[PDB]
Predict the structure of Apaf-1 related killer DARK.
Amino acid sequence: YQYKDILSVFEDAFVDNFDCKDVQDMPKSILSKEEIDHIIMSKDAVSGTLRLFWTLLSKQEEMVQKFVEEVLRINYKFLMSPIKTEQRQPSMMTRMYIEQRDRLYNDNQVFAKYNVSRLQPYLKLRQALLELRPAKNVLIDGVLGSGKTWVALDVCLSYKVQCKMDFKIFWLNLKNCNSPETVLEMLQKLLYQIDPNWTSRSDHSSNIKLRIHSIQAELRRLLKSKPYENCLLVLLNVQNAKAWNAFNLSCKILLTTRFKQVTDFLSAATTTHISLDHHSMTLTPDEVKSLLLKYLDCRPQDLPREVLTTNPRRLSIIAESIRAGLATWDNWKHVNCDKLTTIIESSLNVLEPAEYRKMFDRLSVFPPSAHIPTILLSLIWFDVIKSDVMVVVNKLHKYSLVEKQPKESTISIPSIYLELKVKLENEYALHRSIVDHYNIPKTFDSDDLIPPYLDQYFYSHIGHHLKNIEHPERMTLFRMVFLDFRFLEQKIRHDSTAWNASGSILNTLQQLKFYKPYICDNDPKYERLVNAILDFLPKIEENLICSKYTDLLRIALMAEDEAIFEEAHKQVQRFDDRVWFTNHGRFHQHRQIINLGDNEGRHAVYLHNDFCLIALASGQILLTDVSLEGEDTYLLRDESDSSDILRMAVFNQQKHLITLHCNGSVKLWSLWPKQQLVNSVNLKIVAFYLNEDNIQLHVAFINGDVSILNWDEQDQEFKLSHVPVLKTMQSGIRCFVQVLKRYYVVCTSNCTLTVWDLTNGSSNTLPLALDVFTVLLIFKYSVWRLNFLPGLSVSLQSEAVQLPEGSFITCGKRSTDGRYLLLGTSEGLIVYDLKISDPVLRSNVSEHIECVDIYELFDPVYKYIVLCGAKGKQVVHVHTLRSIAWVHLEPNVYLRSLMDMTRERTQLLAVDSKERIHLIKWSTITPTHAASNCKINAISAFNDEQIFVGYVDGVIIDVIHDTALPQQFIEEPIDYLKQVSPNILVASAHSAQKTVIFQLWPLMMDVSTKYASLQEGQYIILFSDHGVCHLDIANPSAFVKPKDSEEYIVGFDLKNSLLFLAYENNIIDVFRLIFSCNQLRYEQICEEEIAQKAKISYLVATDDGTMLAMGFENGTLELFAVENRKVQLIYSIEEVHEHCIRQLLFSPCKLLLISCAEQLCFWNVTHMRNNQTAELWRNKRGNAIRPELLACVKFVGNEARQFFTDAHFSHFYAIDDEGVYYHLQLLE
């Protein structure tokens, strides 16, 4: 390491000890006399020491090492010992600070190149950073280009700031962020700066605002950690206050701005103000000559006297850049309107004026700050040129105004003048110049997938060119929409560099937004259905962010799925291509939204046994079945009273309901068998509290008197208790609760809190709802927690729970488990955690909520059910919580897996989490034993009339006949159930290693079977973990026990009387089955060992048995053929899947191979062979990159265990682990 970097470390006590006023014997070579006198002339110790430090860092080590050895040696040896050792030891803090400083220097090259330190702004802003608190923020403002970046970077380079920020400072340039979705990109950048870890499965979609809120919450959770507790985050060139609201994180933030409106919005009380426009806060003439001499390197420069010092010289640099070319002379002339950009007009007419003026002015057509291809730049200039394109490009770079990124041969437009003066008269020929622009790709030819198309420009800013054409040409073939454009645009323009992964969704919505302006293409009017699809494309695009930019998939298949009306566009679009398939015309995944007629639900509550009670606007009660499978919906209406419902509570093991209306009446309803008026047991009734230990009711009148009522089971009625009426004398009570069976907490309409001691009756002085679990107070605008502690004076700890701006609370409810609680607001639902006081979740809908309810659930997967009703809507939304996140058929049941396919291929059978068998050709069958809470473990069907099922306790049911087979053989879970012939059945327990064969005897083997087969109607072949066994039906006593092989069988298949077997050590044995009249014999054909390292996961052989293929646990897929008693590798494909291959299947025509894993892949066998039903798959070709990969469909779930095909290989049935269940049909 270098001494200069470590010298900046020892700075504080360096200021305390070193003087620089007592070392004027300083060897003159190290410090020149003029500059050392300048340092000594400084007034205070801190400023002089800082100037000395800067001057020392300016020089090289050939004087730094002399500063070490000499100078201080005469008197400052006491300051040697740390640094005299710190050069060697290099402590961990020193190393971390140096590493961060090097990273910051490498990030900004110009800072290292042409730096200059402004003492006054640097010190002034450093003091604010030192004093700053983890919630406040310091704002620095000034005219555009007043060098706020100078001072910001300079201050952050100081060691004291880094030490106080714990070496955790994150920059963020907030430029071009006036859209609600670029802020999401900036948040992703900040997260990547934090840590490259994010479970992207949280596809919120809907409005992007919800996703930005979710990522804000995630990063807020991630930042409040001890290493990240104090951290500087810097906002650069912030645009509008909206970005600030999207970027306030309760962190040590600081923003630099230039718009005055941001300063107006910013509250100076909570934010310190730093101004660069102050007359004292400006470049001094000494600073003027320092900046001028930074890299001009000339002795006499006094001619630039009275140049724009005000200028942060951001202007000067302009002037200096001219100096590298045009003389200082005529720049004293350039002072005319020096403050205004007329100087920018100069140095351009001074540029060679033959043709370069108009030649450069041609660059106004391009969008600002865009990477311009040089090839297109050739034609945009083809009017004259009269030179070589690269020659004029080189001269353009030479003067000031080209950076010329050569990696992809692209011109870059600078961004300090070309935003201005490019208007002029816009020369002429602008529209025909853009005509040439759209001509160079001749965007009317599209034949197959992606044609020649420039990757960067023509996928990014082509819309700008398309905008400035004739209107008949504007609408006719705008391309864009959806054919192939956005898929390859998303993959190629991917922004995977730092703030995203391979492929994004952003900057295409920002092209489809600002297409919210361009539906003006023909307006809605003509192709108004295209206006509809233009609106819907955002939603479907956010619906499939994941599973699309993770692998080699194309947009077309994932389009051809789904619903709504885009399919009408696909059917027209996709009639000029080969292969292609889906037509997934079925959906059996969950339910939501419950109809409740023309009335609007005021309140909602869930009930046991899957029911819901809705309190309606009309004053009635609607009891409904949530499964949408029952047939009973009851309407409980009070014929005498129609007052609206204000409150209710279900009690008595949810068998009775207590309700309270506006008219001062409280009633009791019986739900599972009589409306009782408890008030009869002119004073109106305001509020109540039901508490259960003895079930008890407390009630408050209008005058404040509180009464106490006891439940009666024998009559199921509320009687008056003998406790005397406490006179609260608090009229206008709005709510009241009992705490610890001793105290009363009362809140009135005037936000007044009172506490009453039931033992003595004394009153203590200290709104929407009050709950006890500490007391939760819910107001319209605020939420309060009141922790209670017992004592002579009751001690209450009040904590505010944060809520979002511009919104108010309507109603709330706490979970039964007391961990989370739900708040309803005009924007939607907020799921809030009590133990962390952070908003965990937000409802997917931006709507005015009028009722909230939560229901704890008993399942390892689903935990809570959420109900919410909307004002002005005739629906009520049902949301389910999974361990917590939104899951987006009863809302508490899901299909697990355990498929079954009939031999004739006419019916498919599935099982759900509630042991119900679903038949799809859709009907539901419930077996009798499901009431015994026995988990469903295996299912097997042969025809539509024989369906058998095995449970976890060794129990066999015939589903259709509801008959149980003899229960005296297997008591363990049944891991396998399948019948091979209409009169035989096999069942096995793997844990007990037991098998039973039923004749539809039964026969018992001490073997565990993973697969069973019948041969010649005589021999039953069983595959075990230890070997293969064969049984004769005619002679069951001749069972052949397996040889005790130490090797487990991992893959196998029996085809064409040839037995393939794979062991864990990557060895295949292939045998030929020879059938004699009295004995089954195995002759060994081959033994061979695989070169692939990974374990074999599945094996499959073709019908003729000539070929085979296996997949491995790492996702590799291998194909071999079997010739000359040898197995030779035919083809290898890697990165097929990231999980182990779950199934492999060969078509009878031998042209196709299906792989079932995290994604379903179709592989072409012919192209597979040539590079060492049939009419449907002939001449089908795949992607150019992977010619053997015909198609691939990604399951929304993590994996799929099994898949089935029909006889014609035209339909494919699949079920992933999440219960979503796919029908994949070939496009006929």
The radius of gyration is 39 Å.
